[PDB]
Structures are given as structure tokens and as C-alpha cells.
Amino acid sequence: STAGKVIKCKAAVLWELKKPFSIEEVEVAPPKAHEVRIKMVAAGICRSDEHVVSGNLVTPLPVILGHEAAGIVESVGEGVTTVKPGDKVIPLFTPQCGKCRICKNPESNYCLKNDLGNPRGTLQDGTRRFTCSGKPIHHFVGVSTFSQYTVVDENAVAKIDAASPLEKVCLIGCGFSTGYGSAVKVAKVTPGSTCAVFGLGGVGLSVVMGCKAAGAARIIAVDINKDKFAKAKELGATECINPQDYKKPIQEVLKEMTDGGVDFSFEVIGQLDTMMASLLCCHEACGTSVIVGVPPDSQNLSINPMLLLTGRTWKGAIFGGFKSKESVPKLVADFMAKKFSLDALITNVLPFEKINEGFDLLRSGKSIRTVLTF
Amino acid sequence: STAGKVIKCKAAVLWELKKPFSIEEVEVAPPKAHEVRIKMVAAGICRSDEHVVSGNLVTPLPVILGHEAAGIVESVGEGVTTVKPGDKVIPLFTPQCGKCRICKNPESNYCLKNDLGNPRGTLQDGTRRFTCSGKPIHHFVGVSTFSQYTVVDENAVAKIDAASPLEKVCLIGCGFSTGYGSAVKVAKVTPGSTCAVFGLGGVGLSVVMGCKAAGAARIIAVDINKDKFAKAKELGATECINPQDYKKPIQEVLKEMTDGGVDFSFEVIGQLDTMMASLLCCHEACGTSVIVGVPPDSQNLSINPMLLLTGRTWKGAIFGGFKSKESVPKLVADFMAKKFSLDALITNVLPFEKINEGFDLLRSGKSIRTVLTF
Ligand SMILES: NC(=O)c1ccc[n+]([C@@H]2O[C@H](COP(=O)([O-])OP(=O)(O)OC[C@H]3O[C@@H](n4cnc5c(N)ncnc54)[C@H](O)[C@@H]3O)[C@@H](O)[C@H]2O)c1
Ligand SMILES: NC(=O)c1ccc[n+]([C@@H]2O[C@H](COP(=O)([O-])OP(=O)(O)OC[C@H]3O[C@@H](n4cnc5c(N)ncnc54)[C@H](O)[C@@H]3O)[C@@H](O)[C@H]2O)c1
Ligand SMILES: CCCCCC[C@@H](C)NC=O
Ligand SMILES: CCCCCC[C@@H](C)NC=O
Ligand SMILES: [Zn+2]
Ligand SMILES: [Zn+2]
Ligand SMILES: [Zn+2]
Ligand SMILES: [Zn+2]
């Protein structure tokens, strides 16, 4: 048994910005009251993990990254009632404490227990459960899934269908839920409408899927990488455009294609130029622009408020606006009923040991989601 | 009769920025086939008219301003079907053509026939109906109500209850509907929510009324002029604060008062600093901030997109988001059914000829709405 004991296991540790992950042996303390230790089965590689490597998203180093994952509960601390050993689960980078102002508000999901805003790199009690040869190792957004075992707070873990294929449903831990929810729950795309989606990674394609589920008439997929277009069309895009092809700014291109602008635009890249273009490309009277991509820390846009006065809405969200713990089981249940499929988003499957290869596939533009198997 | 003939009458003309209006003898052409010539009865003085005088809102000069009004139809073009000579009517500075993409969208109201953004100062056929000593004068927002007679497009006039008191319901032609709608329709203020309203002029007080009607639990009225506070309390505000009383910026004061920020914030002034403060004072995870005020023509806000990414919604609207021609009769009918009262907003009544005194009252902070009688 490992229960009650310190586990020595393999993890991918980032010691320095802009450097490869190091496969280290690390020490993983057992779960305290209201904590859950998880044995990872599958972890996806998301651009947000790469934002930390590049220094675009600041969090304390050294760190174990990883936040899109599925696993099986090895054990639970005192007081835990919602999961138990052997349950299939998905760790929640956005917690759902169920008690804070935000958790009680039916329209919001950014729980006050998150470690996203001002990152400390700990669990909710303010300490770390990882050491690598006595040196302490920071957590990432409470979940740190690029390790064979991790420890997370009870309110940051969801119990899912016992029959769930973890190598696929890990995507519901971040990329798919974020993209799909940004369309169906944050934008609330109306049927018959026209949508523009900027960026066709795992998250952008899931936005395409959500717009299709919502009944959009037109979904205009925008990417500088034309290799992304075939999958975008497969998942419901009606047209694909590459900004590099044009002398005009892409917002003007989109407005001229759509009788003055789209009804719903989504920025799913994380760049200020495209966030501006996404806002400007939605119709000034009836358009809604949603920020999904995470911009580099603390860089500003110059905004003429006249852009909003005529009737536009500009908004953003974390995790597709889904309240994490109650939504994740439902989305997995939808997956099990084949309401949507995730296979098209999973381009590569590698053993955990090949994390760096999986990141290079992401940086190269060649992959959508690489899933790491433990 | 005057039907089919040029009418000679008086109008208040603005010949130059930052100068008084001049009461001039003008000639008003008969209406063309889908136009309506109206005899004015009552016109309100809105800050938006003063924005043109001060150069804050750009429009071609020389011009006849005025857009908040009620009157009696003198004559119609032959293709007119929705009003007749003798009907009471409110001119619509936002038209409702009933045909365009925006008019057919249930959620939007900024009809494509508008002369609001990028104004030409004409009627919808691109021509003008006013002359002074035979030389043309520009219209304002399609309506030009500071004149004893004006001509408007049919799609920019609503027929109202023949029994209604025109010296009161003229406010439904702008200030009241804009504020009220901004709360109930644009923000969709929810029962038990907290709201902050920046600016307590006729429009801001109408936002206070709307938040109260929607059942907000707290309505924090913000004004640098504390003489505006007693009326705000009368109309539903729970608290009134003056930013100048505090050592910290008003957004931080409001966040600390409201467990992290209001659910709905409204900027009802037209200044960039208060648009920023209003955005920042709504809660980062669940807040909605609405721009109502008209910003000055040449200025930008500096916005970090992270402000929206956590879950904020930022939007603007014209005329409270009301589809003008269908809504204005219903709001007049609500008034006649005693659902709300307008008397608190009307602080001064003056003859048309004393228009410059009415603007002086507005500029000195003394009035809410002055209504001019013809
Ligand atoms: N808000 C959230 O809850 C949330 C959650 C997950 C990820 N994200 C963010 O969403 C964004 C997308 O993540 P992903 O994993 O799908 O990324 P990805 O790197 O797989 O995909 C991004 C896509 O954008 C394209 N692209 C890059 N620059 C472009 C430009 N200038 N113009 C047009 N296309 C461009 C790329 O070619 C790529 O196809 C990232 O910023 C990520 O951090 C946000
Ligand atoms: N979007 C629309 O359809 C629409 C329609 C009508 C009016 N408006 C606009 O709404 C705004 C308000 O119109 P109004 O007629 O009520 O104006 P108003 O001048 O009567 O009132 C504005 C109030 O804001 C207060 N104020 C000024 N500066 C302030 C500051 N820095 N901090 C706090 N309070 C401040 C003033 O003391 C005053 O009470 C104007 O910009 C006007 O153009 C917009
Ligand atoms: C609020 C800033 C945090 C945004 C980045 C979150 C990211 C780690 N989540 C999923 O990819
Ligand atoms: C497109 C912005 C122009 C808004 C000016 C509207 C104003 C004239 N209406 C009422 O005050
Ligand atoms: Zn919570
Ligand atoms: Zn992610
Ligand atoms: Zn007005
Ligand atoms: Zn129209």
C-alpha cells in the first residue's frame, strides 16, 4: 500500500524558463483533510502549459505543470465525501468550493479558491506537496498533472463515469470544455448566426464544435496555419481564412464577408492584435466578442469606447464558463452518449516519458492535442 | 391648411461650436412620400445636445439640435401608413426601419438607417428639409426637435396614446427610456443584485429607476455633485457616494463595499475616467458593466484583456437597447397605466424661446431635465 505514505515517483519539472522539462524523481506527500491523491492515467498538452515555459504566463519556479488530465483516486483524506479510492476523476484547474460568492452565483464559475490570478503555486492551504531531492517544487493551478501522482483539493476534483476512457476524456479537463463552453455557455451562440473563430488549436476547434452544436449558420475559422483548416471543416467550419493572404486587416475581411460583421467572434490564440481584430470583426450593433486565449501578462489594448456604445458585448471567461465540479461529470456523460466526439482533437499519443516531444509537436503547429499516457 | 406647403416657423439654430443657439426664422419643406411633418409640443434638454455645442459629439453644422420630444402630426407623405394628421407622436432618434438585419434581430436596436455614427445631418434619403433665408441647415439624428416644426422619416416616429401629457412623456423619447432600458434590457439587472450607477442626471436617475424595478438589493449612486443625491434616494438608490470624499480611487472603494465588486455597473456621464472606474468596480468574475454615456470624440482607454478573461461582461447600448418604434408606444402606455412617474425628472419648465437659459441650467448643474414648451 502507498496510503498514508510518501510516494517517490516520476514527474516533469520545469527548473528554468525556455528550457526542456526535466524528468526527475520527486517526493509526493500523502493527502491532508479534504484532499485527494491521484494516480495519473492520461494528461493532455495545452498551450497554457507552454505559456509558462515561454514566460508569457508567470507562475513560481521550479514547477510541475500540467492541468488537463484524468486519473484514478488512490486515496482520500479525512472529510472527503465526493470521491473515493478507485473512482475515475478529472482534476479541476478552476475549483468549485460551492460556498463562495462566485460559486453561489448561477452565472459565474471563477471560484475564489483558484490559484490563477495571483499564483502562489501551492494547494489551498498554502503549502506544497512536492519535493525533488529535498528542494521544494511548486504546484500549477492547484493540480500539477505532469507527474505520476499528484495531490489536489477535494473541490478541485470531479467524479466521472466509471466506464470513461481516460485517454480521451482528459480533454474535458481543459481544452474541449473551455472551447465548447465558450460558445454554448459564455457567448450563448444563437442558432442561425454567423461566428468567427480565431485560432484552431484544441481549444479553437472545440469552439468550432460548440458553434456547430448551437446551430450557427456560418462558422469562419481563422488561422495563419492552413494545415488546421481540414479539421476545422470536419468539425463544422463553413469557411477557412488565413490573415497572411490579405492586404486588408482580417477584421475588414470578415466584415465584408458577413454584411457588416459576425454575430459572435472568439479569440482563441492569446495575442493582443487578434483580440482587437476579434472585437472589431463582430457587428457593431449585434456582435458579441469572447476572449478565450490568455494574453501575455499585463499588456494593454487601446480601446475606443465608442466600439461598445452601438450595441457590442465584449466578455471573457475561464474554462468555458462551466462551474467545474458540476459540469465536468455532465460533459463526460454527454461524451459517453456520443453527443460529441473527441477523437478528432487527439492527433498524437505518446508515453509520459516523451513530454518534450509532445511540446515540440505543439510548438511546431503540427499537433492539436497530444495525450501523454502514464 | 399647411399640407403640401412650405411652413415658415422658428427653430433654434447652432451656427457655431461653443456659442448660444439663435432663434431663427426657418422654412420647413413638406414631407416626402414616407415622411412625417410634426408640430412640436414639448422638447427636453439632454446632455447629448450639449455635447454637440461643446464639441464633444461631432455633427455637421449649422444644425438644429433636439432629439427628446413629443408633438402632433401636421401632415404625412402619401405612402405613410402608421400615423395620421392629428396623432400625438414621439420622434425616434434611433429609427426602426423594420427591414434591416438589426431590426429583424430580436436582441438589437441600432437600425442601419441611423444617423448616429458618422452623421450626415440629413434625413434618410440624404437630403435636408430645413432652410434659413433659403440656405440649408442640417438635421440632427434624423429628428431636429428644437424647432416649432420638423420633418422625420416615418420609421423614426411613433404614434402614442392620444390622452398622454406631452410635456411629460417627451422624456420617453430619450432620457427615461435610455436609462430604464439600460438596466432592465441591456444589463438585465437581476433581483437581489448589487448595482453602481455613475452619474445622476436624467439618464442616470432613469437607470436607478430601472435597477429598482428589476429588484436590485443595493443601488449605489455615484456623483461628484452631492446635490444630486436626494433625488437619487427618492427614486431608489440605497446609498449615495461622492468619489471626492475618498482617499482611494472609486473602483476600490466600491469593491470594498460590495464583497469584491458590483454585479452591474453603469457609466452615465460620458467620460473615460469614469468608464474605466465603472468597468473596474464590477466583480471580476460575475460583473457586467454597461456604457451609457457618450464618450468624447478623440480618446482611448488602455485595457488589459485579463479584466474580461475572469468573467466580466462589458457592453454598451443606444436608447436602452429599445427597438424604438415598437417600444415607445408601450412605454407611454405603461406611463398612462401608472406604472411609473416622470415628475421627479422634470425640474424646470421654460418656453422654447428660453432655450439658452435651459442649457445654462444644465451646464451649471442645477437641473435634471428642462422641458421646453412650444
Ligand atoms: N480561458 C481559458 O480557460 C483557457 C483554457 C485553455 C486554454 N486557453 C488559451 O487558449 C489559447 C489556445 O490554446 P490551444 O491549446 O488551443 O493553443 P494552440 O497553440 O494549440 O492553438 C492556437 C492556434 O492559433 C494559431 N495562431 C497563432 N497566432 C495566430 C495569429 N496571429 N493569427 C491567427 N492564428 C494564430 C495557431 O496556428 C494555432 O492553430 C491559448 O492562449 C491558451 O492559453 C484559455
Ligand atoms: N447611449 C444613449 O442612448 C444615450 C442617450 C441619452 C444620453 N446619453 C448620454 O448619457 C450621459 C448622461 O446624460 P444626462 O443627460 O443624464 O447628463 P447630465 O449632465 O444631466 O448628468 C451627468 C451627471 O454626471 C455627473 N458627473 C459629471 N462628472 C462626473 C464624474 N467625474 N464622476 C461622477 N459623476 C460625474 C454630473 O454631476 C451629473 O449629475 C451623457 O453622456 C449623454 O450624452 C446616452
Ligand atoms: C486568469 C489567468 C489564468 C489563465 C490561464 C489558465 C490556464 C492555466 N488554464 C487552462 O489552460
Ligand atoms: C454612435 C454614438 C452616437 C450617440 C449619440 C446619441 C445621442 C444623440 N442620443 C441621445 O442622447
Ligand atoms: Zn467557490
Ligand atoms: Zn488548458
Ligand atoms: Zn438624449
Ligand atoms: Zn432597421
PDB file of C-alpha atoms in Angstrom, chain A residues 158-296:
ATOM      1  CA  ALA A 158     -14.692  15.698 -10.249  1.00  0.00           C
ATOM      2  CA  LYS A 159     -16.003  12.126 -10.156  1.00  0.00           C
ATOM      3  CA  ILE A 160     -16.799  10.917 -13.653  1.00  0.00           C
ATOM      4  CA  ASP A 161     -18.429   7.821 -15.276  1.00  0.00           C
ATOM      5  CA  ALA A 162     -16.640   4.625 -14.123  1.00  0.00           C
ATOM      6  CA  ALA A 163     -16.633   3.403 -17.736  1.00  0.00           C
ATOM      7  CA  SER A 164     -14.874   6.564 -19.096  1.00  0.00           C
ATOM      8  CA  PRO A 165     -11.902   6.115 -21.457  1.00  0.00           C
ATOM      9  CA  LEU A 166      -9.391   8.338 -19.643  1.00  0.00           C
ATOM     10  CA  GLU A 167      -7.043   8.671 -22.651  1.00  0.00           C
ATOM     11  CA  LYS A 168      -9.839  10.632 -24.399  1.00  0.00           C
ATOM     12  CA  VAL A 169     -11.842  12.331 -21.645  1.00  0.00           C
ATOM     13  CA  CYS A 170      -8.802  14.066 -20.117  1.00  0.00           C
ATOM     14  CA  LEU A 171      -9.591  16.762 -22.739  1.00  0.00           C
ATOM     15  CA  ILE A 172     -12.701  17.625 -20.753  1.00  0.00           C
ATOM     16  CA  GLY A 173     -10.284  18.807 -18.025  1.00  0.00           C
ATOM     17  CA  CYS A 174      -9.439  21.800 -20.122  1.00  0.00           C
ATOM     18  CA  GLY A 175      -9.326  22.221 -23.876  1.00  0.00           C
ATOM     19  CA  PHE A 176     -12.633  20.790 -25.017  1.00  0.00           C
ATOM     20  CA  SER A 177     -14.712  22.162 -22.145  1.00  0.00           C
ATOM     21  CA  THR A 178     -13.191  25.561 -22.474  1.00  0.00           C
ATOM     22  CA  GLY A 179     -13.782  25.869 -26.205  1.00  0.00           C
ATOM     23  CA  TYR A 180     -17.215  24.214 -26.266  1.00  0.00           C
ATOM     24  CA  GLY A 181     -18.451  26.221 -23.249  1.00  0.00           C
ATOM     25  CA  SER A 182     -17.150  29.463 -24.593  1.00  0.00           C
ATOM     26  CA  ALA A 183     -19.560  29.005 -27.487  1.00  0.00           C
ATOM     27  CA  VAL A 184     -22.576  27.358 -25.832  1.00  0.00           C
ATOM     28  CA  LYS A 185     -22.456  28.949 -22.365  1.00  0.00           C
ATOM     29  CA  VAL A 186     -20.380  32.173 -22.454  1.00  0.00           C
ATOM     30  CA  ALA A 187     -21.285  33.593 -25.905  1.00  0.00           C
ATOM     31  CA  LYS A 188     -24.560  31.643 -25.994  1.00  0.00           C
ATOM     32  CA  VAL A 189     -24.257  31.426 -29.777  1.00  0.00           C
ATOM     33  CA  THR A 190     -27.742  31.640 -31.307  1.00  0.00           C
ATOM     34  CA  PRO A 191     -28.860  29.261 -33.976  1.00  0.00           C
ATOM     35  CA  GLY A 192     -28.722  30.727 -37.486  1.00  0.00           C
ATOM     36  CA  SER A 193     -25.935  33.157 -36.561  1.00  0.00           C
ATOM     37  CA  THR A 194     -22.554  33.854 -38.027  1.00  0.00           C
ATOM     38  CA  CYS A 195     -19.426  33.103 -35.982  1.00  0.00           C
ATOM     39  CA  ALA A 196     -15.708  33.817 -36.437  1.00  0.00           C
ATOM     40  CA  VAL A 197     -13.167  31.707 -34.546  1.00  0.00           C
ATOM     41  CA  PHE A 198      -9.564  32.980 -34.313  1.00  0.00           C
ATOM     42  CA  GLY A 199      -7.194  30.055 -33.685  1.00  0.00           C
ATOM     43  CA  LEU A 200      -7.747  26.374 -34.500  1.00  0.00           C
ATOM     44  CA  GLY A 201      -5.834  24.517 -31.760  1.00  0.00           C
ATOM     45  CA  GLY A 202      -7.545  22.076 -29.468  1.00  0.00           C
ATOM     46  CA  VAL A 203      -9.408  24.946 -27.804  1.00  0.00           C
ATOM     47  CA  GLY A 204     -10.344  26.783 -31.051  1.00  0.00           C
ATOM     48  CA  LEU A 205     -11.622  23.569 -32.645  1.00  0.00           C
ATOM     49  CA  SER A 206     -13.742  22.924 -29.573  1.00  0.00           C
ATOM     50  CA  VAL A 207     -15.186  26.473 -30.021  1.00  0.00           C
ATOM     51  CA  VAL A 208     -15.968  25.377 -33.639  1.00  0.00           C
ATOM     52  CA  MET A 209     -17.719  22.296 -32.231  1.00  0.00           C
ATOM     53  CA  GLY A 210     -19.725  24.425 -29.794  1.00  0.00           C
ATOM     54  CA  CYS A 211     -20.840  26.849 -32.522  1.00  0.00           C
ATOM     55  CA  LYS A 212     -21.941  23.882 -34.608  1.00  0.00           C
ATOM     56  CA  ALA A 213     -23.893  22.389 -31.622  1.00  0.00           C
ATOM     57  CA  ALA A 214     -25.516  25.825 -31.147  1.00  0.00           C
ATOM     58  CA  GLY A 215     -26.811  25.779 -34.711  1.00  0.00           C
ATOM     59  CA  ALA A 216     -24.729  28.522 -36.256  1.00  0.00           C
ATOM     60  CA  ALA A 217     -25.321  29.049 -39.979  1.00  0.00           C
ATOM     61  CA  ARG A 218     -21.761  30.207 -40.684  1.00  0.00           C
ATOM     62  CA  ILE A 219     -18.511  29.423 -38.815  1.00  0.00           C
ATOM     63  CA  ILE A 220     -15.492  31.236 -40.262  1.00  0.00           C
ATOM     64  CA  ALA A 221     -12.310  29.642 -38.999  1.00  0.00           C
ATOM     65  CA  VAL A 222      -9.251  31.950 -38.977  1.00  0.00           C
ATOM     66  CA  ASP A 223      -5.705  30.668 -38.663  1.00  0.00           C
ATOM     67  CA  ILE A 224      -2.288  31.536 -40.036  1.00  0.00           C
ATOM     68  CA  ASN A 225      -1.656  27.738 -40.316  1.00  0.00           C
ATOM     69  CA  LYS A 226      -3.607  26.357 -43.287  1.00  0.00           C
ATOM     70  CA  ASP A 227      -2.933  22.745 -42.126  1.00  0.00           C
ATOM     71  CA  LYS A 228      -5.518  23.420 -39.433  1.00  0.00           C
ATOM     72  CA  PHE A 229      -8.306  24.014 -41.998  1.00  0.00           C
ATOM     73  CA  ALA A 230      -9.236  20.417 -42.829  1.00  0.00           C
ATOM     74  CA  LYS A 231     -10.050  19.517 -39.243  1.00  0.00           C
ATOM     75  CA  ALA A 232     -11.860  22.822 -38.762  1.00  0.00           C
ATOM     76  CA  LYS A 233     -14.115  21.977 -41.742  1.00  0.00           C
ATOM     77  CA  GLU A 234     -14.568  18.424 -40.373  1.00  0.00           C
ATOM     78  CA  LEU A 235     -15.870  19.832 -37.095  1.00  0.00           C
ATOM     79  CA  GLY A 236     -18.238  22.336 -38.727  1.00  0.00           C
ATOM     80  CA  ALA A 237     -16.394  25.344 -40.072  1.00  0.00           C
ATOM     81  CA  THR A 238     -18.047  26.632 -43.236  1.00  0.00           C
ATOM     82  CA  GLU A 239     -15.111  28.724 -44.475  1.00  0.00           C
ATOM     83  CA  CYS A 240     -11.444  28.979 -43.555  1.00  0.00           C
ATOM     84  CA  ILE A 241      -9.306  32.064 -43.978  1.00  0.00           C
ATOM     85  CA  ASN A 242      -5.650  32.890 -43.453  1.00  0.00           C
ATOM     86  CA  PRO A 243      -4.887  36.535 -42.454  1.00  0.00           C
ATOM     87  CA  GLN A 244      -1.481  36.348 -44.100  1.00  0.00           C
ATOM     88  CA  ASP A 245      -3.236  36.067 -47.532  1.00  0.00           C
ATOM     89  CA  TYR A 246      -4.718  39.542 -47.346  1.00  0.00           C
ATOM     90  CA  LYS A 247      -3.613  43.157 -47.736  1.00  0.00           C
ATOM     91  CA  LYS A 248      -6.599  44.249 -45.622  1.00  0.00           C
ATOM     92  CA  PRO A 249      -6.752  43.699 -41.854  1.00  0.00           C
ATOM     93  CA  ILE A 250      -8.655  40.495 -41.108  1.00  0.00           C
ATOM     94  CA  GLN A 251     -11.459  42.387 -39.299  1.00  0.00           C
ATOM     95  CA  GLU A 252     -12.237  44.294 -42.519  1.00  0.00           C
ATOM     96  CA  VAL A 253     -12.100  40.999 -44.491  1.00  0.00           C
ATOM     97  CA  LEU A 254     -14.572  39.418 -42.063  1.00  0.00           C
ATOM     98  CA  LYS A 255     -16.934  42.413 -42.046  1.00  0.00           C
ATOM     99  CA  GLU A 256     -17.045  42.437 -45.865  1.00  0.00           C
ATOM    100  CA  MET A 257     -17.800  38.649 -45.870  1.00  0.00           C
ATOM    101  CA  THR A 258     -20.648  38.993 -43.380  1.00  0.00           C
ATOM    102  CA  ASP A 259     -22.808  42.043 -44.134  1.00  0.00           C
ATOM    103  CA  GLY A 260     -21.014  44.235 -41.600  1.00  0.00           C
ATOM    104  CA  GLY A 261     -19.602  41.706 -39.132  1.00  0.00           C
ATOM    105  CA  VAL A 262     -20.206  38.438 -37.357  1.00  0.00           C
ATOM    106  CA  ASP A 263     -22.671  37.851 -34.627  1.00  0.00           C
ATOM    107  CA  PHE A 264     -20.133  36.058 -32.389  1.00  0.00           C
ATOM    108  CA  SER A 265     -16.356  36.248 -32.532  1.00  0.00           C
ATOM    109  CA  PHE A 266     -13.905  34.275 -30.450  1.00  0.00           C
ATOM    110  CA  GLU A 267     -10.209  34.916 -29.846  1.00  0.00           C
ATOM    111  CA  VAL A 268      -8.639  31.543 -29.091  1.00  0.00           C
ATOM    112  CA  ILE A 269      -4.963  32.415 -29.538  1.00  0.00           C
ATOM    113  CA  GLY A 270      -3.833  34.758 -26.743  1.00  0.00           C
ATOM    114  CA  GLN A 271      -2.454  37.680 -28.753  1.00  0.00           C
ATOM    115  CA  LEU A 272      -3.401  41.367 -28.388  1.00  0.00           C
ATOM    116  CA  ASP A 273      -3.545  42.013 -32.153  1.00  0.00           C
ATOM    117  CA  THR A 274      -6.053  39.236 -32.743  1.00  0.00           C
ATOM    118  CA  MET A 275      -8.072  40.180 -29.663  1.00  0.00           C
ATOM    119  CA  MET A 276      -8.510  43.618 -31.209  1.00  0.00           C
ATOM    120  CA  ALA A 277      -9.375  42.112 -34.620  1.00  0.00           C
ATOM    121  CA  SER A 278     -11.876  39.766 -32.978  1.00  0.00           C
ATOM    122  CA  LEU A 279     -13.631  42.661 -31.244  1.00  0.00           C
ATOM    123  CA  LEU A 280     -13.699  44.798 -34.389  1.00  0.00           C
ATOM    124  CA  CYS A 281     -14.963  41.971 -36.639  1.00  0.00           C
ATOM    125  CA  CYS A 282     -18.252  41.478 -34.757  1.00  0.00           C
ATOM    126  CA  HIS A 283     -21.117  43.665 -35.928  1.00  0.00           C
ATOM    127  CA  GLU A 284     -21.270  46.980 -34.123  1.00  0.00           C
ATOM    128  CA  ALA A 285     -24.987  46.627 -33.391  1.00  0.00           C
ATOM    129  CA  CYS A 286     -25.439  42.998 -32.536  1.00  0.00           C
ATOM    130  CA  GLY A 287     -21.991  41.445 -32.131  1.00  0.00           C
ATOM    131  CA  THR A 288     -20.556  39.603 -29.123  1.00  0.00           C
ATOM    132  CA  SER A 289     -16.783  39.040 -28.856  1.00  0.00           C
ATOM    133  CA  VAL A 290     -15.422  36.475 -26.401  1.00  0.00           C
ATOM    134  CA  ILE A 291     -11.808  36.356 -25.205  1.00  0.00           C
ATOM    135  CA  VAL A 292     -10.677  32.774 -24.641  1.00  0.00           C
ATOM    136  CA  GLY A 293      -6.967  32.993 -25.357  1.00  0.00           C
ATOM    137  CA  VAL A 294      -4.700  34.038 -22.486  1.00  0.00           C
ATOM    138  CA  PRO A 295      -2.718  37.180 -23.373  1.00  0.00           C
ATOM    139  CA  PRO A 296       0.879  37.689 -22.190  1.00  0.00           C
TER     140      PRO A 296
END
